[PDB]
Amino acid sequence: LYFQSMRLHRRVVITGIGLVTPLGVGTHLVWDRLIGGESGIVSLVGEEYKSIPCSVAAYVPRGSDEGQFNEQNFVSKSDIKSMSSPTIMAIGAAELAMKDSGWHPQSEADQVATGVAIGMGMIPLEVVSETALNFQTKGYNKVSPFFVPKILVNMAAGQVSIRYKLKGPNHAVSTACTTGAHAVGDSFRFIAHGDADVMVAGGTDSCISPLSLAGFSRARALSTNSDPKLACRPFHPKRDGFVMGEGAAVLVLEEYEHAVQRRARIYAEVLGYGLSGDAGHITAPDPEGEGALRCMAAALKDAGVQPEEISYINAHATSTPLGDAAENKAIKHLFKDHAYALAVSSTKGATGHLLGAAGAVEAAFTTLACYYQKLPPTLNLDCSEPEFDLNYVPLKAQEWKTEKRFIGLTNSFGFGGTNATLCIAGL
Amino acid sequence: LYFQSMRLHRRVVITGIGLVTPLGVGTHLVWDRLIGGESGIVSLVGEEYKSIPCSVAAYVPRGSDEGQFNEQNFVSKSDIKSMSSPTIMAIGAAELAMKDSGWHPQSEADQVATGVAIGMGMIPLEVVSETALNFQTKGYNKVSPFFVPKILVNMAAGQVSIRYKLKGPNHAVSTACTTGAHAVGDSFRFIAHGDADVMVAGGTDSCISPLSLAGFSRARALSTNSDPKLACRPFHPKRDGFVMGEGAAVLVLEEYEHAVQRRARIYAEVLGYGLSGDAGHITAPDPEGEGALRCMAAALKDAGVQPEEISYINAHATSTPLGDAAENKAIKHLFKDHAYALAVSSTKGATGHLLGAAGAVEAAFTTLACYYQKLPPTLNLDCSEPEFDLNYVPLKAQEWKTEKRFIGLTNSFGFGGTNATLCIAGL
Ligand code: NI
Ligand code: NI
């Protein structure tokens, strides 16, 4: 009364999706490859990777062919000098998302109404070590003036803002594997609360190098399986660590009345956002998944949605022994008998683990799932331990229509025990 | 109606402040040194800095004496192996903030009610280049397993969570110079909206090395003035770039009813949070300060506070030609004739520019200002160009009491054109 005010929360919808991933570039193409059970995980070739026990990764395919990434479609040869690889991928995904929403702010009022929330999980390590080398060897003057702008996490968000004249909230998170989920969630709360009417929201990461793969490997996080068709297998008995990918994924979120008055196409509504912390270990998850259960519960509370109204969960499950099990337990614990009436899939068998981009690419897939009422498969799931007895949509996509509202969750958990869930619903 | 729901916003207050800064460690001590017109900016000594045109910086004083930072008061010699310098400073500031609030969550319910929002502006570059060196020279096995946990931006937030069992929202931003402001603002919105009843919120950065100073210098951002008593002079005619500092600052924000029911001491209330983007240049600010004017206006709108109710502005002003002028113009433009009835100061002459920590240390100072009704000075302001004609509280602190509510703003602007304002009020 004296303690608790009311203020307007607007409803928020997704009107644009832009994807630069190991499955390819372009939204309907990546969706088709995903649903079709395709994967971007390949073998590492290069004598530079000989020292590391990992031998697979998921690269964004590059070139001018179908579904490939051509940097020069989006950025000039000069711009490329001042930008990191993740920033270039973010600029590409952003342009594609805005084209997909039809949103091209030209008036001062629309420019001010649109912000950017694009996070990055890790800065590019090779920019740092190559500058350190130049500085140690040739001195102060061989350090680039674009060194700082190239290594700051917020520079993708900053470059997308300048390129498209987006003057609303300018925000960047860096929460490891949860980055992309927080970016969409934070953008959801900003629009809801009134800070903005449109947000260009997502994640980017492109850090596959021997040094980064050496680091994740020494942390015991990466699969040592040398067969790229088999390495990443969420919920599988033989899962043995994640497979690193790269990419960017960007969603245009928009205030609902704003979307309707301009006659935009709406994929889905964002209903809720949940966050929690394990407060356990810096790399390993709560083995009982208590923090997972809390962020999912929080998102349901924020949405005003009961467990029994959920149709689909896009799992974080990265193909790790402890992680996949923890998450499985969380779902069973929260959803109880409804755990077996819903479907769960993890799309990381297709994309790899895209780090700062994982949570946004998975929010985009969950958004497509709700819009189409069709679920992408979990790859490689060709057997199961007795406790892994949910419907994991193994291997083949499945239609999942209702006359009820199709409501989904997407989970993202990260090093440091940082957890987020998004609740996203079809109209 | 169909578009616009209402939901509960709780009021949010600050109950704890923890400071690890170039002025010293400890809240009332740092406040006394600040008000007293002291500075932490010193000369760079070291042959390793010979190559760089900058010759001053602000270090956290280290040792077991009064106001000094002794790492081993907070972390063990083993922990120090798995943590970066900024993470250790964040752990110190966090412990001090929670001691200052009297908040020590022991029950599962209070642990779940308390989250951490601690950002970092730049990862420590020397961790990256030293590992790159070890990897290139001795191979995969000489890479530390703590390499990844040591270089991720969210690891300070993660370590503070694990150390104190904080299980609420776990969130880390990385928005350059705006980091600490966003962290407090995001933590404010989380508590208001219901995601948490307590947040351990702030920023940390500790990246002074030749390489980082080389980078900021090549970007033309740093003062080349060799006199440490004079280098950093916000709003001064001879200002010529910022002076890099290091440190951490952490605030405990708390739901208002929660603070009152446990009989905690409340410093101030957080009323509003504003965010914007210049959409201009990647390092230089809008020269007319339009983005500054928009984030300040947004914070006032969020607060429900008219320009004429503001008593104090803690300026971002870092001692740069374009920046200080832009911000000056913004204030004059928003506040009009009331610009001359309020007071403005920049405390960066004392602390240096603390990067990821600047916005949180400046929110703490603004919070102290409101609680005491006493304003810290702008250092070195011994002359003025004709357009710099506000009350900058030059050189000496000033009492600034009212029977009206003391309302302040604190501004933070950053590379990438990312802007934030906080509105904070005495009770
Ligand atoms: Ni709100
Ligand atoms: Ni709210």
Swiss-Prot record, chains A, B:
Widely expressed. Higher expression in heart, skeletal muscle, liver and kidney which contain high levels of active mitochondria. The modification N6-succinyllysine is found at K77, K81, K142. Its EC number is 2.3.1.41. One of its GO terms (molecular function) is 3-oxoacyl-[acyl-carrier-protein] synthase activity. Its main location: mitochondrion. SMART domains: PKS_KS. It catalyses: a fatty acyl-[ACP] + malonyl-[ACP] + H(+) = a 3-oxoacyl-[ACP] + holo-[ACP] + CO2; butanoyl-[ACP] + malonyl-[ACP] + H(+) = 3-oxohexanoyl-[ACP] + holo-[ACP] + CO2; hexanoyl-[ACP] + malonyl-[ACP] + H(+) = 3-oxooctanoyl-[ACP] + holo-[ACP] + CO2; octanoyl-[ACP] + malonyl-[ACP] + H(+) = 3-oxodecanoyl-[ACP] + holo-[ACP] + CO2. Keywords: Acetylation, Acyltransferase, Fatty acid biosynthesis, Fatty acid metabolism, Lipid biosynthesis, Lipid metabolism, Mitochondrion, Transferase, Transit peptide. CDD domains: KAS_I_II (cd00834). Inhibited by cerulenin. InterPro entries: 3-oxoacyl-ACP_synth-2 (IPR017568), Beta-ketoacyl_synthase (IPR000794), Ketoacyl_synth_AS (IPR018201), Ketoacyl_synth_C (IPR014031), Ketoacyl_synth_N (IPR014030), PKS_Beta-ketoAc_synthase_dom (IPR020841), Thiolase-like (IPR016039). It is found in: Mitochondrion. GO terms for cellular component: cytosol; mitochondrial matrix; mitochondrion. It comes from the Eukaryota. Residues 9-426 form the Ketosynthase family 3 (KS3) domain. Gene3D superfamilies: 3.40.47.10. It is an enzyme of class 2 (transferase). The modification N6-acetyllysine is found at K77, K142. GO terms for biological process: acyl-CoA metabolic process; fatty acid biosynthetic process; medium-chain fatty acid biosynthetic process; short-chain fatty acid biosynthetic process. The active site is at C177 (for beta-ketoacyl synthase activity), H316 (for beta-ketoacyl synthase activity), H353 (for beta-ketoacyl synthase activity). Pfam families: ketoacyl-synt (PF00109), Ketoacyl-synt_C (PF02801). PANTHER family: 3-OXOACYL-[ACYL-CARRIER-PROTEIN] SYNTHASE, MITOCHONDRIAL, POLYKETIDE SYNTHASE-RELATED. NCBIfam families: fabF, PRK07314.1. May play a role in the biosynthesis of lipoic acid as well as longer chain fatty acids required for optimal mitochondrial function. Belongs to the thiolase-like superfamily. Beta-ketoacyl-ACP synthases family. This is 3-oxoacyl-[acyl-carrier-protein] synthase, mitochondrial. It comes from Homo sapiens. The gene is OXSM.
